[PDB]
């Protein structure tokens, strides 16, 4: 059929005329297949013969596609597509199953010949003209245009979806209790009706769709109990991911490890605790694609613990809008966090992991707050509300960091839960200079031509030291100069730097860095009992900084 | 007398196309409020459902008119504004008056409801398309475009401007000293009257607007009380090596801005290589220096002026204890205005309040909103900002993650 629905008006882009691309000569077999296909389409009204007056043509061909030994008609709409207006959206988001609510029954109805069932605008039909060529293009071809949405045309996906939405609206208004999800060609239909009353409601939906020209040639409401969709298995009362045979191999190419990591990342939305950092380490510096990478020991631990998690099937439950969502987060390694979302303890709607990347230098309190933000955004999308959090951080740890830190934050309601390891702050800088602690005026310079450097200090106690440095830079020499002071000082120390950069780094209390010098510095800060770090401007002739500037720069620059 | 008035032709900027900005996800209660607001607007003819042949999109949000009062829809026309406003603000600009900021009192009155009286040019309508999304992507998204001038669009006051002039004329003739400025959906109304007569005059002016499609419109700013005197030098300043060292950092920073700051005499005194906790055996040519520096930090910055051809930018720092500092400049550290915002909880909530207050000041002073450098993670700002937003405009913003000891100087 062809739907009686009103057409969507379509246009070409500003100042563009339609396509006029010459038909190429085809083999005799392909001509004959096309003649037969177009005869059938024309009888159904899909297509209409037209005159040689209509200028405009787009090439057509045929092949054996999805093994089509009956033969399939293909139209190369590249030129028309370049010339056609942009349409809404296209599709820009799919549901997550953990957002659905439990149903008694769901059925899928596949709409037969979906695009060919929807009328095309008509003022636009002329631009879809095509020609079945003569043998050797010796004589004039048989010309047609489309009356319906064509298979490879730019507007077919959105016009189809728009038409389906309009067609479903009166049915949904009469049946406010039935849920319908439209995905390409398919319709998923869920209700809370008994098996027999559901079956009748489906037959009603099929007769309503028939009235609007859409057949569901799937008689008696087809597809079988566990539905496969977008890498999930859906049941009316639970969901999971679809497979995940992890191979049993001694040799793993880069291709196999990439594939494995994708499957593990995918399973991790319902299998709690999945881990891929060590498998991920193996992918450092792409060694090709067919190259075998031996599994490191930490990688071997990881794959073992993953197989163990994938041992027995695990399903998520669906969402009950009467209840709060609870999200729990655990620190699960080094870059790594893992979370679970549930409404009744232990029955996860879903799970996930977060492996933060936000800066070269961070700490656990920052990273946890980031995981919490990611989870917050996720919940809004999936359930349209925020969850209550359970976090492995004491309230006093969190509020001391955030009230003292220079960036704004806020997070939903949350409670402490004791699931080690707990997030803490591994050292704290003093607020005021330390009475009786030695003061180290540190300074670094590099040349920039030679990359020759120096880093040292002068102390209120007259102590002094410079060390040579080699393939370094200004920023590195400031850091090394602070590290040198920490190495040579006792348990309490005041450090006076003229580096904003260093101070900026150290003030944020990192516990982790992508700079090795910085991680060295952090280890020292953790051993200290007290450190006050202060800043002064370079070359102001400030006492102390004056002097170290003079010995770190006699060599340097 | 019950049919349409005539449309002003609107062009998008030369060679540009309409906006195609992603709708953000919304909470369930916000979605429900918008669907109800939009069913009503559509029943009144203000907006119409559109089909897939419109590929444009502008984000929409729900906020409160006050505290859990009623919901209001807020359309984020920032992109359509840019695409209409290399060429508007020039074809149909509203001049900004320099006497506004000199008034004892300025009231802000929302006049946006008036715009819905005027038909939007049929050919521009598609560019105002927006979407009410569904939760979990379960359902495509409700799509509409406007038939009338929309509230957050800079073309609306530009176009309504001839009507506003006529509406306001008898009132401005009767009160020649009242300054009235229109920005976006609001009027800013300044006078030097005592506070009770100021209010009686605003009530009068409300009666005028009422006859023309506004329903009892609306505050109180006191911009003649808006202050300089920021950067502050301590009084127990000259006691420790550390105090004096912090002092010199604050002055070095300040000499980037203000001509004439010194510090020479202060650095002497730091003379040796001393314990940070030591108290000091001078303060004399240093006390004089410190006093003169303090005198210059009271006064405006000698060589910095507003350039109407340039963006304003605002920086804000979290000071702690519910205090926030900010600066507005067009060229980094040539400050045109500095100030403070304080409560005495949240952080994101205080921050969105600071932003709205700074933007309002900026509109009063320059007729422009600033682009903000906000001290917050983007995602966190994006999740939470509409919870506390109550204004009808939205400034540009960027997110800033670094904060030199700029915090300390301020
Ligand atoms: C499978 C299931 C479980 C609970 N409620 C539903 S409602 C629905 F069937 F329409 C529906 N089918 C869908 C398929 C993918 C995405 C959303 C769906 O909603 N569906
Ligand atoms: Ca240095």
From Swiss-Prot, chain A:
Impact after mutating residue 189 to M: 27% increase of DNA-directed DNA polymerase activity. 10% loss of RNA-directed DNA polymerase activity
Annotated phenotype, changing residue 153 to A: 73% loss of DNA-directed DNA polymerase activity. 70% loss of RNA-directed DNA polymerase activity
Effect of substituting residue 183 to F: 70% loss of polymerase activity. No loss of polymerase activity
Domain (Reverse transcriptase): residue spans on this chain: 44-234
Consequence recorded when altering residue 55 to G: 64% loss of polymerase activity. 57% loss of RNase H activity
Consequence the record notes for mutating residue 512 to Q: In strain: Isolate PV22
Effect of residue 65 to A: Strong decrease in RT binding affinity for all dNTP substrates and in catalytic efficiency. 100-fold decreased sensitivity to ddNTP inhibitors
Binding-site residues for Mg(2+) 1, renumbered to this chain: 110, 185-186
Effect of residue 438 to N: Virions contain primarily p51 RT
Outcome of mutating residue 157 to G: 34% loss of polymerase activity. No loss of RNase H activity
Effect caused by changing residue 184 to L: 90% loss of polymerase activity. No loss of RNase H activity
Mutagenesis or variant effect for residue 279 to S: 21% loss of polymerase activity. 16% loss of RNase H activity
Outcome reported for the amino acid change (mutating residue 231 to A): Complete loss of RNA-dependent DNA polymerase activity. Complete loss of RNA 5'-end and 3'-end cleavages
Outcome reported for the amino acid change (mutating residue 225 to A): No effect on RNA-dependent DNA polymerase activity. No effect on RNA 5'-end and 3'-end cleavages
Positions marked as site (Cleavage): 440-441
Subcellular location: Virion
Motif Tryptophan repeat motif location, chain numbering: 398-414
Quaternary state and interactors: Heterodimer of p66 RT and p51 RT (RT p66/p51). Heterodimerization of RT is essential for DNA polymerase activity. The overall folding of the subdomains is similar in p66 RT and p51 RT but the spatial arrangements of the subdomains are dramatically different.
Note from the entry: Error-prone enzyme that lacks a proof-reading function. High mutations rate is a direct consequence of this characteristic. RT also displays frequent template switching leading to high recombination rate. Recombination mostly occurs between homologous regions of the two copackaged RNA genomes. If these two RNA molecules derive from different viral strains, reverse transcription will give rise to highly recombinated proviral DNAs.
This protein's domain notes: RT is structured in five subdomains: finger, palm, thumb, connection and RNase H. Within the palm subdomain, the 'primer grip' region is thought to be involved in the positioning of the primer terminus for accommodating the incoming nucleotide. The RNase H domain stabilizes the association of RT with primer-template. The tryptophan repeat motif is involved in RT p66/p51 dimerization.
Entry protein name: Reverse transcriptase/ribonuclease H
Source organism: Human immunodeficiency virus type 1 group M subtype B (isolate BH10)
Residues of the full protein shown: 600 to 1156 of 1447
């Amino acid at each position: 059929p062809i739907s009686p629905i009103e057409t969507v008006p379509v246009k070409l882009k500003p100042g563009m005329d339609g396509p006029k691309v010459k038909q190429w000569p085809l083999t005799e077999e392909k001509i004959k297949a096309l003649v037969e296909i177009c005869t059938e389409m024309e009888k159904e009204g899909k297509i209409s013969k037209i005159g040689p007056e209509n200028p405009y043509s787009t090439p057509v061909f045929a092949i054996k596609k999805k093994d089509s030994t009956k033969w399939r008609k293909l139209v190369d709409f590249r030129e028309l597509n370049k010339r056609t207006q942009d349409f809404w959206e296209v599709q820009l988001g799919i549901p997550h199953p953990a957002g659905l609510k439990k149903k008694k029954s769901v059925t899928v109805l596949d709409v037969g010949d979906a695009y060919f069932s929807v009328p095309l605008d008509e003022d636009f039909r002329k631009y879809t003209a095509f020609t079945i060529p003569s043998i050797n293009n010796e004589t004039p071809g048989i010309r047609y245009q489309y009356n319906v949405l064509p298979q490879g045309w730019k507007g077919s996906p959105a016009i189809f979806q728009s038409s389906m939405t309009k067609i479903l609206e009166p049915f949904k208004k009469q049946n406010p209790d039935i849920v319908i999800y439209q995905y390409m060609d398919d319709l998923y239909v869920g209700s809370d009706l008994e098996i027999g009353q559901h079956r009748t409601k489906i037959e009603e939906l099929r007769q309503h769709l028939l009235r609007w020209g859409l057949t569901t040639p799937d008689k008696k409401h087809q597809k079988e109990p566990p539905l496969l969709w977008m890498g999930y298995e859906l049941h009316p009362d639970k969901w999971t991911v679809q497979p995940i045979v992890l191979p049993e191999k001694d040799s793993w190419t880069v291709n196999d490890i990439q594939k494995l990591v994708g499957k593990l990342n995918w399973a991790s939305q319902i299998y709690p605790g999945i881990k891929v950092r060590q498998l991920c380490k193996l992918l450092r510096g792409t060694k090709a694609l067919t190259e075998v990478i031996p599994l490191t020991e930490e990688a071997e631990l990881e794959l073992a613990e993953n197989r163990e998690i994938l041992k027995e099937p695990v399903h998520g439950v669906y969402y009950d809008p009467s209840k709060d969502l609870i999200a729990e987060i655990q620190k699960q390694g080094q870059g790594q966090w893992t979370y679970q979302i549930y409404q009744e303890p232990f029955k996860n709607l879903k799970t996930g992991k977060y492996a933060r990347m936000r800066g070269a230098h961070t700490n656990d309190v920052k990273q946890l707050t980031e995981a919490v933000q990611k989870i917050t955004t996720e919940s809004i999308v999936i359930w349209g509300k925020t969850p209550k959090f359970k976090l492995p951080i004491q309230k006093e740890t969190w509020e001391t960091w955030w009230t003292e830190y220079w960036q704004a934050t806020w997070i939903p309601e949350w409670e402490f839960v004791n699931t080690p390891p707990l997030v803490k702050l591994w050292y704290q800088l003093e607020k005021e200079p330390i009475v009786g602690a030695e003061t180290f005026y540190v300074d670094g310079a590099a040349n920039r031509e030679t990359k020759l450097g120096k880093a040292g200090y002068v102390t209120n106690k007259g102590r002094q030291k410079v060390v040579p440095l080699t393939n370094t830079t200004n920023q590195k020499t400031q850091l090394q100069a602070i590290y040198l002071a920490l190495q040579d000082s006792g348990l309490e120390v005041n450090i006076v730097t003229d580096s904003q950069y260093a101070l900026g780094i150290i003030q944020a209390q990192p516990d982790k860095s992508e700079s090795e010098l910085v991680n060295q510095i952090i280890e020292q800060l953790i051993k200290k009992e007290k450190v006050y770090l202060a800043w002064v401007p370079a070359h102001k002739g400030i006492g102390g900084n004056e002097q170290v500037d003079k010995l770190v720069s006699a060599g340097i620059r | 007398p019950i049919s349409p008035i005539e449309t002003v032709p609107v062009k998008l900027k030369p060679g540009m196309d309409g906006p195609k900005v992603k709708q953000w996800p919304l909470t369930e209660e916000k979605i429900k409020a918008l669907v109800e607001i939009c069913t009503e607007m559509e029943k009144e003819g203000k907006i119409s459902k559109i089909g897939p042949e419109n590929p444009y999109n502008t984000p929409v949000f729900a906020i409160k008119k006050k505290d859990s009062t009623k919901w209001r829809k807020l359309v984020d026309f920032r992109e359509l504004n840019k695409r209409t406003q290399d060429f508007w603000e020039v074809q149909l600009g509203i001049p900004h008056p320099a006497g506004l900021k000199k008034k004892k009192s300025v009231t802000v009155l929302d006049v946006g409801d008036a715009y819905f009286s005027v038909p939007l040019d049929e050919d521009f309508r598609k560019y105002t398309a927006f979407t009410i999304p569904s939760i979990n992507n379960e359902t495509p998204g409700i799509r509409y475009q406007y038939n009338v001038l929309p509230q957050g669009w800079k073309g609306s006051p530009a176009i309504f401007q001839s009507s506003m002039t006529k509406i306001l004329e008898p009132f401005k003739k009767q009160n020649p000293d009242i300054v009235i400025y229109q920005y976006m959906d609001d009027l800013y109304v300044g006078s030097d009257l005592e506070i009770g007569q100021h209010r009686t005059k605003i009530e009068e002016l409300r009666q005028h607007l009422l006859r023309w499609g506004l329903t009892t419109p609306d505050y109180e700013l006191h911009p003649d009380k808006w202050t300089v005197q920021p950067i502050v030098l301590p009084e127990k300043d000259s006691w420790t090596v550390n105090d004096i060292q912090k002092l010199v950092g604050k002055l070095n920073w300040a000499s980037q801005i203000y001509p004439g700051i010194k510090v020479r005499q202060l650095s002497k005194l730091l003379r040796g290589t001393k314990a940070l906790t030591e108290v000091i055996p001078l303060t004399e040519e240093a006390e004089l220096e410190l006093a003169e520096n303090r005198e210059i930090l009271k006064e405006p910055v000698h060589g910095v002026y507003y350039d109407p051809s340039k963006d304003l930018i605002a920086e804000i720092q979290k000071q702690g204890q519910g205090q926030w500092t900010y600066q507005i400049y067009q060229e980094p550290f040539k400050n045109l205005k500095t100030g403070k915002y304080a409560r005495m909880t949240n952080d994101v909530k205080q921050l969105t309040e600071a932003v709205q207050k700074i933007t309002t000041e900026s509109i009063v002073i320059w007729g422009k909103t600033p682009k903000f450098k906000l001290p917050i993670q983007k995602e966190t700002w994006e999740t939470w900002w509409t919870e506390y937003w109550q204004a009808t405009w939205i400034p540009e913003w960027e997110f800033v993650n670094t904060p030199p000891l700029v915090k300390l100087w301020y």
